[PDB]
Amino acid sequence: AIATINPTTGEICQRFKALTPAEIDAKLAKAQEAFQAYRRTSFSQRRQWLENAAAILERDTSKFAEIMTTEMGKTHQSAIAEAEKSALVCRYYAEHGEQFLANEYTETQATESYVCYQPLGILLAVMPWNFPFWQVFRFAAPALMAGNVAVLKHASNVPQCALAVEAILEAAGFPEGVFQTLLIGASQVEQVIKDPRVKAATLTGSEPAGASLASLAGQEIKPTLLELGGSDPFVVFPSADLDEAVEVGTVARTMNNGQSAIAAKRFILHEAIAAEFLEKLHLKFASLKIGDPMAPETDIGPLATEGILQDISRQVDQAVAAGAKILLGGRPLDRAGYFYPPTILTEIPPGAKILQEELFAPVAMVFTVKDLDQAIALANDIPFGLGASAWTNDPAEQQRFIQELDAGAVFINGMVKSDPRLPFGGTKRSGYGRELGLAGIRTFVNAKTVWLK
Amino acid sequence: AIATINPTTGEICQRFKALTPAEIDAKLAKAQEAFQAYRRTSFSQRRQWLENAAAILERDTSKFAEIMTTEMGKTHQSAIAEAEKSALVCRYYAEHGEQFLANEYTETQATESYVCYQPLGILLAVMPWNFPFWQVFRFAAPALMAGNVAVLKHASNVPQCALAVEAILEAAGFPEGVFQTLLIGASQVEQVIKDPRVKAATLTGSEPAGASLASLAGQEIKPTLLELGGSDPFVVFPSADLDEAVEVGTVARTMNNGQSAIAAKRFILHEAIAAEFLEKLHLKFASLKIGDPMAPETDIGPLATEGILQDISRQVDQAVAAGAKILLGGRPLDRAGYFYPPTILTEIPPGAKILQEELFAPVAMVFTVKDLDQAIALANDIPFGLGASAWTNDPAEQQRFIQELDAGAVFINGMVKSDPRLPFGGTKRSGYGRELGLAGIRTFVNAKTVWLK
Numbered sequence A, B: 001a002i003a004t005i006n007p008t009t010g011e012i013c014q015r016f017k018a019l020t021p022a023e024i025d026a027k028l029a030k031a032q033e034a035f036q037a038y039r040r041t042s043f044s045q046r047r048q049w050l051e052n053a054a055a056i057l058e059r060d061t062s063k064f065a066e067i068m069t070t071e072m073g074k075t076h077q078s079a080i081a082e083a084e085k086s087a088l089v090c091r092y093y094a095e096h097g098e099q100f101l102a103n104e105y106t107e108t109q110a111t112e113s114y115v116c117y118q119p120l121g122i123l124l125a126v127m128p129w130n131f132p133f134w135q136v137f138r139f140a141a142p143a144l145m146a147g148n149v150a151v152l153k154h155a156s157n158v159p160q161c162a163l164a165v166e167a168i169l170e171a172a173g174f175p176e177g178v179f180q181t182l183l184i185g186a187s188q189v190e191q192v193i194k195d196p197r198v199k200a201a202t203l204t205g206s207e208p209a210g211a212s213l214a215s216l217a218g219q220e221i222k223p224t225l226l227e228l229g230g231s232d233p234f235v236v237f238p239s240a241d242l243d244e245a246v247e248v249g250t251v252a253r254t255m256n257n258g259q260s261a262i263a264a265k266r267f268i269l270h271e272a273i274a275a276e277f278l279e280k281l282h283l284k285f286a287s288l289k290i291g292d293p294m295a296p297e298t299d300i301g302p303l304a305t306e307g308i309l310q311d312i313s314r315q316v317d318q319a320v321a322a323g324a325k326i327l328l329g330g331r332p333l334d335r336a337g338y339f340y341p342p343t344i345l346t347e348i349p350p351g352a353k354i355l356q357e358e359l360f361a362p363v364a365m366v367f368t369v370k371d372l373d374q375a376i377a378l379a380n381d382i383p384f385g386l387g388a389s390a391w392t393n394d395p396a397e398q399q400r401f402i403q404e405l406d407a408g409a410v411f412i413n414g415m416v417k418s419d420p421r422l423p424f425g426g427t428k429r430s431g432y433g434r435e436l437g438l439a440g441i442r443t444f445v446n447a448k449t450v451w452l453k
Ligand SMILES: NC(=O)c1ccc[n+]([C@@H]2O[C@H](COP(=O)([O-])OP(=O)(O)OC[C@H]3O[C@@H](n4cnc5c(N)ncnc54)[C@H](OP(=O)(O)O)[C@@H]3O)[C@@H](O)[C@H]2O)c1
Pocket: A126, A127, A128, A129, A130, A131, A135, A153, A154, A155, A156, A157, A184, A185, A186, A187, A189, A204, A205, A206, A207, A208, A209, A210, A212, A213, A226, A227, A228, A229, A230, A260, A261, A358, A360, A386, A426, A430
C-alpha cells in the first residue's frame, strides 16, 4: 500500500513497509524527548536551521522536483516551482518567527500583564499527495520555528517525498526527533491522535480524512486545523480584461494537472461576455500539450493515481448521461499511464449531481449568468468555500464580490494563490483555521496569559 | 430535567418543557433568517445594543443575582459581582469590536492585499451552571459584535438564568433570532451541531460534554472552542507575602462555593513556610460563615446540585480511606440543602486517585515540596492545564514559574482571574482556543484574505 507507482507508466517502482504500532510508539517517545530539548533552543538557532533547509531546497530544486514528478505526475517545471515555494516559506518564518511570537503587553493594574507564546509539543500533520513538498513545509516551517516537534503522516503514494522532507530537515541541522516521517496507513493515524504525547493535529486533504482526524482529536480535547477541498468559482464580468482572464483561468484550472484545492473549477460568465470567453477558453484548452511530465514542453501530465482517474471518468460520464454537453475532452486517453484530457462541460442540467462535487482533474464546468446577484448565488451554491476569483473593473462590483463570496480567500482580477505573507484557509466544508502569515505560527502554541502583581 | 431546584432547600421551584426536534429546527430557521439581516447592521448599531445590554445588567444586578442564587446557590453578593462583570465584557466589545475587526493590510505586489473579518453565521454555545451569566456574556458579547447570531444551550438547572439572558438581549434591542435560548437537554445538542445552518460551536463545562461536542463538530468540519475544568496549583514559596497568600488562597479555593474551573485546588507549599501557611489557612477556612447564600454575611452557600454533593463526598471519603489526612471538614453537613464544608486534606498518599481529579467544592489538597523543581513537576502532574498561581518575590523564581507552569494563564502574587482585557483559555485537557481580549472576537469569524491586482 505504501509505494511509489509512477502515474506516467503505471509501474510499481518501490514498496515500503508500514511501521508497526510499537515502532510508532518508539518514534513518539523520541519526539517527546526531542521536544524537551528543542523547546529550549534559541530563535537564532531555529532561524539558522530553517535557512539551511531553504538553501538545500534552493540548491537541489531539480532533484527534488524529479521525485515529485516520478511519484505523483505533476510537470517537472511545476515541481521546481513547488520546491522554490517551499524554500520561500522556510525563509518567511526564519525571518519573522521571533517577532511573530514576541510577548504582547496589555496595560492593566498589574505591574506586568502580557500574552506569551509557547510551543504545545508534538504536532501530528497528515498531508496529501498533490503538493507533496509545499503542503509539508507550509506546516513545518512555522511549527518548528515556534518550538514544536512534528510527526508527519504523508499520503501513501508519495513515500519518497515524505522521506526526502525528513532528510532535508536532518541535513539542515534540526535535532533527531524534531521532525519525523511516519510511513503508516490512514488506519494508523488513530493511534497517533490518541497518544497522550501528541498535543494537536493538522490535516490537508479531503473531507472524509479531515472528518476522521478532527472527530478523533475533538474527542481527545486536542485542537485541529483543516485545509480541505474546494470547488472555487472563477467569475468573469463584462468589464473584465477578457484575454487575461482566459489565460489565467486556463492556468488556474489546469495547473497540477487540475489537482488543486484552489483550482478554478466553476467558470461563471456574465452573458454579455460568455460567448467570447468560452470560445477563447475552448481554444486554449484544445492546444494544451498532454504527455510526459518530465518533458519541458508538457502542459498536462497524468493524474496521480488510477483511483483519481476512475473518479473523474465516472463523474463526467454521469454528468454527460444527464445531459451536460462536452465542448472538449470528456474521456480518458487510450495510452499508458493515468491520462485524462483537458475537458470543458457546458449546459449542465439544474440539480445535476456534478454541480456539488469537486472535480480533481483538468475539467472546467461553465455557467452563464445574467447579473451579479445570480453570479454570487451560484458561486456560493456549493458545500465548500475555499477560494474564489472574480474579474471586473467596476469598483462597486469588486466590493460586492469581496463582501459576498463565501470563501476563505477572494482574489479580484487574478487567480487564487497561497502566499507565505498572507494567511490561507477555508470556510464551510473546506475547513477552518489559517496557515501562513502571522496566523500560521500562532495556530499551535499555548497563548499563555501572564499577570504579575 | 429542565427545572429550578433551589439548592439551599432542595425545593423544586419551576419545571420547564424541553423543545421538540421540530421546535429546535424552527428556532434555527429563525436564526438563519435573522443572520441575513443582522450581518448587515453597522458596528455603531451593535455597539448601541451591547451598551444597552450592559446598562440593563448594571441597573438590575441585585435582581439578576437573586435568580442566580436561587437556581444554583452562589452567594447573592458574588452573583452581584458576576452581573457587574457581565456588563463589563459587554462594554469591552462594544468599545473595541470595530477596531478589533478592521481590515489588516499586508504589503505585496497587489494593489490591495489584506485580511478582513466576517461573521460565520449561527454559533452554538453550550454553557455550565457555575457562572450562569458571565460564561454566557463572555461568549455572546464578542460573537454578536462580530455579526454572528447565537443559540444557547444552557445547563438544565439554570433555565431561569438562560431565559433572563435572552430577555436582556431582547430588551437591549437585538433583533428577534439574533440570540435565542434553547431549553433542551444534553442529548439534544447533537441535533443542533449536525444542522447545516450551524457553523461553529463553543462549550464551557467538563470534559465529557466538551469531548462529545468537539468530536461531533469535528466530524461536521466545524470549528470549536473548549473551556473545560482545571486543578490549578497555588504555589507558595519562602519569599512570598504569606498573609496575603493565605487570604487570597482562601478566596481562590472557596469562591463560588469552590465551584470554579480556576479555583486554587492544589496548594503546593515550600517546606520553609508550609507549617505557618497551613496553620493560617486552617484558621481562615474554619472562620468562614456557612449558610443561606441570600444572606449578605454568608461566605459559603450550598453546592449547586445533589450530584455535585455526592461526587465530592465520594472523592474525599475515598482519599481518606486511602490514608489522606483530614485537617478540616471532609463530611457533608447535617442540614437542609446541598451543603459541604470547607475542607483541607493533607499527606495524600502517592498515586491516590484524587491527585488527578478536579474537586468542584471548597476542598483544598495541600502538598509540601523541597524546591522549585519539585514544585513545578507537581504543579504540572495533572491532565488539566487551565490556570496557575505562584507566590514569590525572587525574580528568577518568578521567571521559572512563568515559563515552566503548564497552563493557559500564570499569575504571580495574585489569584488567577479572567479579565475582558486579556485572552483566557486552557491547555492540555483543559481545552483550547481563547475567549476575551482580541482573541475572543477573532474566534468565530471568517478571516478572509483579499487580493486585488
Ligand atoms: N485546502 C488546502 O490547502 C488543500 C490543499 C491541497 C489539497 N487539498 C485537498 O486534497 C485532496 C487531494 O488528495 P486526496 O483526495 O487523495 O486526499 P485524502 O484521501 O484525504 O488524503 C490526504 C491524507 O489523508 C490521509 N487519509 C485518508 N483517509 C484518512 C482517514 N480516514 N484518517 C486519517 N487519514 C486519512 C491520506 O493517507 P493515505 O494516502 O494513506 O490514504 C493522506 O495522507 C483534495 O480533494 C483537496 O480536498 C486541500
